[PDB]
């Protein structure tokens, strides 16, 4: 949580877009915030900037 | 909350003791250089387009 | 403001009566024009009364001004009388001293006695007193002149052990229209700058307060005092009463960690050396720090040349006017306070405020040190500037006017 | 308390708390109003009457050591002597009253 | 010529009508002639009556607005004397409804403004007229008489006015909830809003901190100190140059977040909270107390507080029976509940409060006299330690500011000599 | 030509107000002040008195 890196376990299919909400390093993401677009096989992603 | 006249605003300035320099009082005709005609003595499109 | 325009209160009644019936007269003072004149008078008076009631500004109001104060500011100063505690009292054995024994001090005191007392066989008893009038001259320890006493009462005196206080009176609307701008007793807002002056000024007998805060991280940034310790503030008061009241008031209006600061060797005399030990706290802890000073009593000189006026005007009028301004009795101008510089133009303005119809030609103002020999004739100049901790007063003899 | 009666405009005089008072109560449009006197010298004019708040507002008026007057509920001259009263509190009682007020 | 200056330094003098009417009659007589007739029938009587009515009306209208910015006044004026700080008005809503239940006959029309009553006898009307489908189910919309925050009990209603073939006005939980305001602020609780706001503002922080932190339920005592120096002023607080030191003692604090929220409102905009040098009271959490973001459109701040270090004391007492019978457990409970401060005048063994065997003997003497006391000695040690040696007892124990002491029922031991 | 040096303080007014006030003073608006009649010397002390 301090470094802002997230890991999915199962690889995501194509065209599945995720969002995230909460608070990080001061900035707030109350509204959904895009951080990942699963390309088909990758399961390691990182969070966005509020 | 609905004090519209500059009179009430200046009265509140006296009541609370704030200055009155930076506040614009009124755009009314009592202010200098306004009139119901007031087209005279200005660059009226014959001299320079303003 | 918003109080004028009664000249057209006549044409309205004329048009009214004309519209009422045809077109006829309303002139030459018959019964019809007399009714018209009556309408004139009543309408004008009603509009005048409306304009008087409407304008309620602090610089305009009177008597109802107290509510303009009570909207924000603290209540006026109630009249009070100063009592005496533990006044020695000696007489024969087994005597009772009844209440309201009108003891009299030698400069026409007329003191009373609060609680009835019985003299013990030791012959030494202490009786509590109370003064009669709000205006009471500070007495001196002597044998108080006795008016009413028993068949056994021998004498009464004032020992050093007795502790006295001071009264309060003479709160005219001039002080109310002056202390509006400054004594903003924002009891609601305590830990701030404008709040400290007003909360301290609630203490009795206190005349004026100054509070200057650095707001920076370097020394010598305020108008008139040095710093030593940065991130702090220093307080100066005049006419100071006993320590504890002003100490509690000062401690009750701050919040910062170490905002207290003695200025430097160039500042008003500190009241106490290390601190002021404000013993009690709401948290019951034994915290002790209060630091504050008093001003330097300067002295000012005025000399002015004027004309002779419409008729004869004695110089006593001008002297009384300038002295009254200096004491601060005139409404609006606070006069001379801790941190106010004398100005020749301001003094001339005060003179014109009191006695008009006189033509002032020259004005001169000078300031002199405490107890110093009277300033030389070449000392006077147009403008003098006082620092933060400099208080100056003017007497009757410091102003001379030999006018052309 | 104070003896009152059901009349739209009246005045009662009394000697209470080592002081001489003369009070006047009269209906003015919607709410009541009051005039308070002492020594024969007027104190206040047209004090609007509310339930629970004291009649004298200013420090130099109510006491160095005097008292003050409070109406339990909003005044109504039809109800005097039945449910609505006017009480007087001497200096110590009024002081603890104001202590309890806030 | 008959005008009175009825506005003086004191207030407004409003006259009785006989006086103004006599003045107006005199004015008209001086206008026309001393023998004129002023009666209701004559036109002059109409004019003088109009003048008197107008003059008294304007005088009274001025008098009513004599002193208004004093906050005793009411009816709109007081509204804005309030709203200069904060305040609301109106608030006269009526609980609108939705999704009603009606079972009726086929193709029947419901006439509007029907009267539906609930179990405690509160009357509510309908809003819009509607027909019924042949199946026998429709939904209505409801409005009551008085603009109050009434609550509908979850029970089927009852019918007061009956249309044709219509019954069973009942509920479904699918009914929308509109909770209405009911004239919540008339005239006097505005004054009390003023009172509370002025009371909250009046305190300093240190004054407000203890009182407003004690507001949390189950709290016992709170000790707050301001460092005022970078030195050791009372305790060794040399964390920052100008912190605030906060110690809170509780019987558990069932809500951890409540004290954080209480501390949040007690901030001064220029004072850090961080206190301690890894040796003072142990904080609940290291870096932050994870405050709730804000009651009103804000972001997540930080606060820091610490709790006292728990201690426990051993009490010895030697007594003689005297001239009555007392069971030792009674005296044990006496001392233990004295440690909590059940009796007035004694605050307790609060944070940073030492314990002395003199005060324990004072408690015993206060409750049960008639029992002589030989000796009472006291001791203290850190929490959880085994029983110390007989040499560890002393008359008085000086105790640190960030420590809290407790006494247990069996921890104290008595001896009947 | 008149020049005046004033600090704002806590309550301040537009300079145009002082301009109009002093100018209408010059003709003697106030009671007791005859104004700048012929042969009447002008002194800044009276300007200060007027603004006072």
What can you see in these coordinates?
- Chain D: This is Cyanophage baseplate Pam3 plug gp18 domain-containing protein.
- Chain D: InterPro entries: Pam3_gp18.
- Chain D: Residues 1-90 form the Cyanophage baseplate Pam3 plug gp18 domain.
- The structure is cut from a larger assembly and holds two copies of chain A (50 residues), three copies of chain C and one copy of chain D (102 residues).
- Chain A is mostly beta strands.
- In chain A, 0% of the residues lie in helices and 42% in strands.
- Chain A is built from no helices and six strands.
- Chain A has strands spanning 5-7, 16-20, 23-24, 27-28, 33-38, 44-46.
- Chain A has a two-stranded antiparallel sheet.
- Chain A starts with a strand and ends with a strand.
- Chain C is 23% helix and 18% strand.
- In chain C, the strands form five sheets. In chain C, strands 1, 4, 6, 8 and 9 form a five-stranded antiparallel β-sheet that branches. In chain C, strands 12, 13, 14 and 15 form a four-stranded mixed β-sheet that branches.
- The longest helix of chain C is centred in the N-terminal third of the chain and has 24 residues, at 31-54.
- The two termini of chain C are 40 Å apart.
- Chain D has 102 residues and is mostly beta strands.
- Chain D contains two helices and six strands.
- Chain D has helices spanning 59-62, 91-101; strands at 9-15, 20-28, 31-38, 41-48, 68-71, 86-89.
- In chain D, the strands form two sheets. In chain D, strands 1-2-3-4 form a four-stranded antiparallel β-sheet, with no helix packed on it.
- The longest helix of chain D is centred in the last third of the chain and has 11 residues, at 91-101.
- Chain D is globular, with a radius of gyration of 13 Å.
- The interface between C and E is large, with 41 and 51 residues.
Percentage beta strand of chain C: 15-25%
Question: What's the alpha carbon Rg of chain A, rounded to whole Å?
Answer: 11 Å
| Coarse shape of chain A | globular
Q: Which H/E pattern describes the elements of chain A?
A: EEEEEE
- Major β-sheet annotation of chain C: 5 strands, antiparallel
The strand order across the widest sheet of chain A is 1-6
Strand content of chain A: 35-45%
Number of strands of chain A: 6
Counted beta strands of chain C = 15
Order of helices and strands of chain C: HHHEEEEEEEEEHHEEHEHHEEE
Radius of gyration of chain C: 30 Å
C-alpha termini separation of chain A: 15 Å
Calculate the terminal CA-CA distance of chain C, rounded to whole Å.
Answer: 40 Å
PDB class: virus
Keywords: Pseudomonas, phage, baseplate, virus
Entry title: Pseudomonas phage E217 baseplate complex
Chains A, B: Triplex gp45
